């Protein structure tokens, strides 16, 4: 790491710096005064103050990247969002006013909710008691849950079952299915939950 340990990651948030001084607790004021004399890492080329920035979508693009092709990954992400928005607009126009109130057209909300639905609540981990490892069920922290949801989405889209179907359309269709609580990704989440329940009897094998 070319950054010495004294370097701190920058905090890129306009509101944080525009917060009124009177609204700062003593600890917050101390933190600001301390940061006034701390070296800061240069802002990475991925995140900015843009109001349209979305960390979840940025991480999804990074996970979808292959061999440093950020341009292509971002292109696929934006194409997927555009396809989702177009499909939702088509459904909204073709649908009656009664259900138009519920039909969602925000692709970012659709994506967030699809990933949230795909998130697994409990995972299977090898735990060892006496010298033998067993696939004991275990809670999954939030980072692991989000990562598993995103990775399942990406892998299911990357499967070879969908032939001559471009990743934009594949991912848009899968995201819509997940948003409506269906599709292979939710099926995989349910399979994980079913296996965890089947091995429920081994919970005590966990020590932590």
């Amino acid at each position: 790491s070319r950054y010495s340990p004294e370097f701190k990651d920058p905090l890129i948030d306009k509101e944080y710096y525009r917060k009124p001084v009177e609204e700062l607790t003593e600890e917050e004021k101390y933190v600001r005064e301390l940061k006034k004399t701390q070296l800061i890492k240069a802002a990475p080329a991925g995140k900015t103050s843009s109001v349209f920035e979305d960390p979840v979508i940025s991480k999804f693009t990074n996970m979808m990247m292959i061999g440093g092709n950020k341009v292509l990954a971002r292109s696929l992400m934006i194409q997927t969002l555009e396809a989702v928005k177009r499909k939702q607009f088509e459904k909204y126009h073709a649908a009656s006013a009664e259900e138009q109130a519920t039909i969602e057209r925000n692709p970012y909300t659709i994506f967030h909710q699809a990933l949230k639905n795909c998130e697994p609540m409990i995972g299977l981990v090898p735990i060892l008691k006496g010298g033998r490892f067993y696939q004991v069920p275990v809670p999954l922290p939030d980072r692991r849950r989000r990562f598993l949801a995103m990775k399942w989405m990406i892998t299911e889209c990357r499967d070879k079952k969908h032939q001559r179907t471009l990743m934009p359309e594949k991912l848009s269709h899968k995201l819509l299915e997940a948003f409506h609580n269906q599709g292979p990704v939710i099926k995989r989440k349910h399979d994980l939950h079913k296996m965890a329940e089947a091995n429920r009897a081994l919970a005590h094998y966990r020590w932590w």
């Binding site: 070319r2 950054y3 990651d9 920058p10 905090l11 890129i12 710096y17 940061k35 006034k36 070296l39 800061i40 890492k41 240069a42 802002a43 103050s49």
Partner: peptide, 11 residues
């Protein structure tokens, strides 16, 4: 500076 807009990326 705190947002990191004035640091020369040494990487």
């Amino acid at each position: 500076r705190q947002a990191g807009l004035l640091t020369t990326d040494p990487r």
